[PDB]
User: Fold Spike glycoprotein from Severe acute respiratory syndrome coronavirus 2.
Amino acid sequence: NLVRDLPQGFSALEPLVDLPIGINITRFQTLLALHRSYLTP
Amino acid sequence: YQPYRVVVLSFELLHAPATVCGPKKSTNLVKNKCVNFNFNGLTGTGVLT
Assistant:
């Protein structure tokens, strides 16, 4: 109901998937959209 | 003189988890009596009801 918050109840998260990848991961980045496409070189 | 048709297989394990394996034959399910069982790796002995 409130836009700002993470609420103050309790609920737990079920498992979704599990992937056998075998990499090294040290960083990440979100990938969200926009309206006017810009590409940086 | 007669030519052939050749195919190679080459197997390789790595630090990655092994994802390609072979099939796993099964056995039908027996209830109400003392048996051994193997349910996806979970081994034991007992009566399944």
Notes: The radius of gyration of chain A is 18 Å.
